[PDB]
């Protein structure tokens, strides 16, 4: 009846983090002075360069280059000694206007609440009764422990730690009829960048003590927990040094860590109107509601859209065996309970506010009770 | 007892695809000089722009500009009026050595049977007994409809095509004993690129006439069935000059659709250390091999690894109740017959051969007997 499941997340540092971070740095500039920008920004990173490509098309007056910079300021890159600097490095901007086919076909002259999906796609919710916050323990678990990265890098705890990160759970549940309950942790690995100055042996000795005892109850570790700290044995070059970052490259980190089900579509860098980001958010605002109103213990939810298209094209719920109703009736109760168009989920959770650099680090769910994180009280 | 899921894909054109297919004719190229490359090459597409970023160790001498030319020649670019021309597009470069932190801790003075993951990560493999190449139905469809549409571009049948196309299908399913059970096509959108010439009643009865007819049997559709042809009404500009394109933005139109699972990882511009790729290939052949050799109808695989790790960290196996053998009896199985560390999986599924770029559109798995396809005959 056990089994095993692993789940990773990455620090604010780490290059394809740094590129959502940044493009929704960009959106949150639109938003705070044209609630309605139509915002599609990609980032790429790599030594010295940030780039930002896509299409905007918006009434605000935005400075990129400071933008840009701040958001890299407040990861922590800045010295060439961390192999990135805010100050110096190279921001080029392809930005155009949004395709005036698209916006044509989506949201001119048409009403809000009858907009148009930004684009097709598919996407999923999910929700799960083992943490209080209705998410995995393995990627909550993986999310606490970067996050307990960039606190003690923060107050100089640990000098030697840079900005870039990778941490991964793997956790033993058993199976419930059909929630899973955790055990113990399996095994977990912490990368880290790091000074030239700082032994193997001092960072791994930290990263058990000052890191892991920190974030992980003892009641889940033992004497068989395996252990991987520093594994490459050496990680000074690091953030887009190390490795090119991309928008969009760490979507199953954004989201449950590999449960549930994913429809592919990136987060960062876009307005409501594209429903990769507001299906999804209200995807997770129904499991969520289903799981604190008690209708079931975990629960899966599936939606997709055509683009110029407001309803939902087709709308699943998966609950595990751990609802007494069946699907068709949890179907009935969610279609009473909300309505899935993007111009009433923009009014349903507040999507023209600039709070999405909060979003990009750390997972988009299970967090600081953002709107789709605060479940509906169901009426049926 | 029955349900709807829903898939995507995209065509050739797609400028996330573009990327894909760029990012694996370089790793191509590095291959057929030097088996051994070290690659991690990341593309973005914007109007007139394609850029590598990333990072390659090799002894090849390879031409960039003729490769990324090449490339986009192949997908059909070739003129301004298409929105992209591989004669006349900027080719930029920001490649630099792999990160030599990353190279001593992964594979140099390594055998290379223990060579170590090149990263962290986990990844899935999944395979369903309800089509023969072992593939949901609604992705293989959706591929099918793109690959038609590229079909009549090349070869004159629809002039008006452009190389740029998405499509989705939602399937109305049976659950049977853990298995599922395809009923009727519920939905199918197509969108696609086209010229100024033609008008939109011409496209969608060519879409429903030429393409989903001569894709998806007619016993699937009905007089209920629901078809968004061209639902934006007008899609001139596409390509690159619509859309940003990136490099591992469209992971789950190359695995399985949103059945499964996913890790996170993209395949493409990746050589074989980069577990992201290998794995998700092992994993995929483990699956495949589970259900073609009678153990189970549909099952799901999950595997992860550490940086500089050789073996798996974590190994399950779940039948979704489709076999009579537990996790731990096909555990046990798949330990006996199969060797997941990265250096033992380069040789049983050829993975220095330059054959990327053909995976690189219309889905990695269930097409064209790839070594990961073909299954292994267990022994237990
Ligand atoms: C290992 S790199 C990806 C592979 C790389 N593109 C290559 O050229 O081999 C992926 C992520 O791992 C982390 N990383 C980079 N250098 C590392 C090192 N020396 N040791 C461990 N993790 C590292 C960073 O978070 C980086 O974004
Ligand atoms: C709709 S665009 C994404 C949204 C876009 N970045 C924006 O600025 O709104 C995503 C994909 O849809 C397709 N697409 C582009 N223009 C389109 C149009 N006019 N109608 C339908 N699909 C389109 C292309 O395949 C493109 O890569
Ligand atoms: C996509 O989300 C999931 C999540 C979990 C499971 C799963 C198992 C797995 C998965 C391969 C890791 N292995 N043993 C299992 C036993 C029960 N359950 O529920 C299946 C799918
Ligand atoms: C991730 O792969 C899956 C695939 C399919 C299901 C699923 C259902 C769903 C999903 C929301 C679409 N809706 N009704 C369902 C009934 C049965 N089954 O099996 C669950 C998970």
């Known amino acids: 009846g056990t089994f095993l499941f692993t789940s990773e997340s990455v620090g ?18 639109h938003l705070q002075q044209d609630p309605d920008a139509k915002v599609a920004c990609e980032t790429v990173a790599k030594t010295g360069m940030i780039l930002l490509a896509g299409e905007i098309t918006s009434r605000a007056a935005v400075d990129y280059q ?21 100050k110096t490095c190279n921001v080029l901007v392809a930005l155009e206007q949004q395709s005036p086919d698209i916006a044509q076909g989506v949201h001119l ?7 148009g999906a930004g684009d097709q796609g598919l996407m999923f919710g999910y929700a799960t009764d083992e943490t209080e916050e209705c998410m995995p323990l393995t990627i909550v678990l993986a999310h606490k422990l970067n996050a ?13 730690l840079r900005p870039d990160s990778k941490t991964q759970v793997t956790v033993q549940y058993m199976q419930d009829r059909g929630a899973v309950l955790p055990i113990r942790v399996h095994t977990i690995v912490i990368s880290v960048q790091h000074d030239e100055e700082v032994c193997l042996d001092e960072m791994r000795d930290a990263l058990k003590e000052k890191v892991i005892k920190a974030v992980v109850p003892a009641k889940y570790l033992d004497e068989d927990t395996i252990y991987h700290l520093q594994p490459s044995g050496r990680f000074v070059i690091g953030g887009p040094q190390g490795d090119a970052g991309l928008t969009g490259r760490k979507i199953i980190v954004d989201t449950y860590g590999g449960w549930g089900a994913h429809g592919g579509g990136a987060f960062s860098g876009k307005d409501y109107t594209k429903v990769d980001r507001s299906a999804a958010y209200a995807a997770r605002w129904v499991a969520k509601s289903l ?10 939810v599936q939606v997709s859209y055509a683009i110029g298209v407001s309803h939902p094209l087709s709308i699943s719920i998966f ?12 179907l009935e109760i969610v279609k009473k309970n909300f309505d899935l168009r993007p111009g009433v989920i923009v009014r349903d959770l ?19 009770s953002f709107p789709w994180e605060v479940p509906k009280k169901l009426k049926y």
Chains 1, 2 share one sequence.
């Open 350 to 368: 507040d999507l023209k506010k600039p709070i999405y650099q909060r979003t990009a680090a750390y997972g988009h769910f299970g967090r600081d």
């Open 148 to 160: 307990k990265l960039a606190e003690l890098r923060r107050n100089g705890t640990l000098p030697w």
């Open 12 to 29: 604010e540092g780490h290059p394809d983090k740094i590129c959502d971070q940044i493009s929704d740095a960009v959106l949150d500039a």
């Open 319 to 330: 609950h595990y065996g751990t609802s007494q109703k069946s699907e068709r009736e949890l």
């Open 66 to 86: 400071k933008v840009v910079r701040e958001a890299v300021k407040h990861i922590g890159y800045d010295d060439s000694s961390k192999g990135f600097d805010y």
């Open 291 to 300: 799981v604190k109103g008690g209708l079931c213990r975990r629960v899966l």
């Open 109 to 115: 002259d048409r009403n809000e609440e009858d907009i």
